[PDB]
């Protein structure tokens, strides 16, 4: 296989996290084309469900592997696999909360399977903000510059994330993340942008909090000639 | 004429502007095909020469009337002609420089001419640093986010931008804009993407400090389906 | 009269801003003891008047003279006397309006008076916000961090700041300030804190909106032994 | 022991954390005068030692208790003892490293002693900045505005903080925080500040990485009459 990767894959989740001192876990699984950037994740909160904020927050945190890469931009995700990759976020939002995120990455070639395990950090959501009253439906859709720093072989993420909410309106989010391969690169991307479209379906239910995310991802570069 | 714009129009230009104490003004003229999103600008330091900051600041200041956009997103700019529109920005950078820029814009529609006036201001640019050094040499190409305030009837920006260094470097600026219209709009559009491309050639010669700008742009939904 | 200042002297203030558009011009005079940190400005809107925008934007940008130093800290402002100083500040306020204002002082010996000239510009207020809709009432007294910048001998200003609302809520700024001495420094300060109490007394009328401007300041060292 | 609290203290502490993916654990034990906000703590790196960044990063995460509350401003945190209270922090250092921290106090009235247990994330430090590569030496004394929420009977925490380096420059980190009294509140203060010196001993050895914080708090209203 080509990086050990098959355009018809599964996926595991693990993330624990706590956020204004509420501890929780969540597992999950999932199915994608990491050829086509396209991704569909299952999750399910298996300890300290139900959240008191909303799950839209840690919706980024569920893999770069699954971006569509043109021939003409270097795909340092995919030349990562198998080992895979890492990467580390802070989230800014405007109202002063601050998360921080970090993953880990691994392809199991013989399970055609890839691994995800997360933790994810937050503070200082305002009780009156739309987190704490889940008034917020889901990501709007973006464009991340991502940078190459050559002298570490690793690469910089920044884009300017928007939480549509149910009134109508929305809440701002500054996401700075650094992508790390486990895997010394050979190889470094010129600058280029990824854009993405990452939506959530509620499936919670009398006896969990659960939901499905579903996250394509295309890499670019200027639309100017 | 539709909104008194054509496909090869002048534009006649002027700013008055001061950075840390530094007073200044430019005058210039231009041609471009604001169906094309395509633009020619032509400055020239007429008081202040020659700056002892980066002229590659001030290139944003030079009008949203050149941007392509497409039928299906509504152009709040050209709907705004010929009375023009006016804009505010903020420029926020990396070392904490930061910078302010207004314009209005007017078309003249006898004359076939655009007539553009800005002012800006800036304060804090480190000695040591990029600006002051003069080590830029142009923008990055960039992915700008339009976000309609329809109880206002305005729009806002969110870029965050990238100025090139002569050293292989990057100095980081993000710019929040505010865009309104003279006119009373009958439509809003939606949320959407501005792809920009500017790049600034020096002219300048024994008498004067001078340079040519060139601005592409094209508006966008997502590319993701 | 050292550096020729006295205990008690007069100010003359002259201010041209525009914020979003909106040009205005103030001007006034005052009455303080810079040995003790403290002043009286009286100031009147001439044109431009009344101003769309809360005046409280305003007050910070009316002259370190006025800051009582004691023997132990250097004072970099009154050893530039009678010269004068100059100084640059930026802040952006959290709901996203960045301003600018820079300011020139001078001490006139032979009036025993002091000229101070500036300029103040801002974008981006928010039409429903407490500025433009002029719900302010005062700033809450603060506390600045001054730093010395040796091989440029100037100096940094950081300080954290709270508009107060009549309403009951808080607005905060960030001020960045660079401060200059137009009269090279022999001896440059340690970093020390500057703790500045500013209040505003409306005195309008029928023909012009104008006020009183209190400040008291005091420079010191960490409170802890 | 008003609130069960002495003026000669133990403080037993443990810190579990991780940066950039380097989990690490602390404990460590301590002696202080509650009521003079003076404080010794004696830490050691049990797991993951020795650290990869700076442990400067980690010092104000080690309790408000330690603060000198003069008769005249309302002690929120004498007043939660013995049951103790609970705090969440975010600071965003300049060069875009972010870290959240969060703790537990707990006054254990039978041993005369306090329980601290906290927790420590933080994000992208720049391979060649001062914490990576260990260059730090000490906080700088500050002045904290502490403003209360009293419809949430909580508090907010401001102060703009400057991390000292071996080389000579200081690098700035802003300390946002959220201070809960795990017991209910039946008197809130009014806006205060909180200066504070913390200083930092190191003490390792070839066995361990260890060191000594000296914190001295205390609180005051503004300097001027």
Chains 1, 2, 3, 4 share one sequence.
Request: hydrophobic fraction near 35%; aromatic fraction near 12%; include cysteine.
């Amino acid at each position: 296989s080509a990086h050990g990767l098959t355009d018809d894959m599964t996926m595991h989740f693990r993330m624990e996290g706590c956020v204004d001192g509420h501890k929780f876990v969540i597992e999950g699984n999932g199915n994608g084309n990491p050829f086509k950037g396209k991704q569909f994740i299952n999750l399910c909160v298996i300890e300290g469900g139900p959240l008191p904020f909303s799950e839209d927050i840690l919706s980024a945190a569920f893999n770069r592997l699954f971006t569509e890469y043109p021939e003409g931009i270097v795909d340092y995700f995919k030349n990562s696999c198998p080992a895979g990759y890492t990467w580390h976020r802070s989230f800014r939002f405007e109202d002063g909360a601050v998360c921080i995120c970090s993953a880990d990455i691994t392809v199991n070639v013989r399970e055609n399977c890839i691994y995800h395990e997360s933790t994810f950090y937050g503070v200082n959501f305002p009780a009156d903000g739309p987190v704490m009253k889940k008034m917020t439906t889901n990501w709007e859709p973006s464009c991340e510059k991502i940078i190459p720093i050559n002298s570490q072989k690793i690469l910089k993420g920044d884009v300017s994330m928007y939480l549509l909410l149910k009134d109508g309106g929305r809440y701002r989010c500054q996401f700075d993340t650094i992508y790390k391969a486990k895997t010394e690169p050979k190889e470094m991307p010129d600058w280029h942008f990824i854009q993405h479209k990452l939506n959530r379906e509620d499936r919670s239910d009398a006896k969990n909090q659960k939901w499905q995310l579903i996250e394509h991802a295309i890499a670019s570069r200027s639309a100017l000639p």
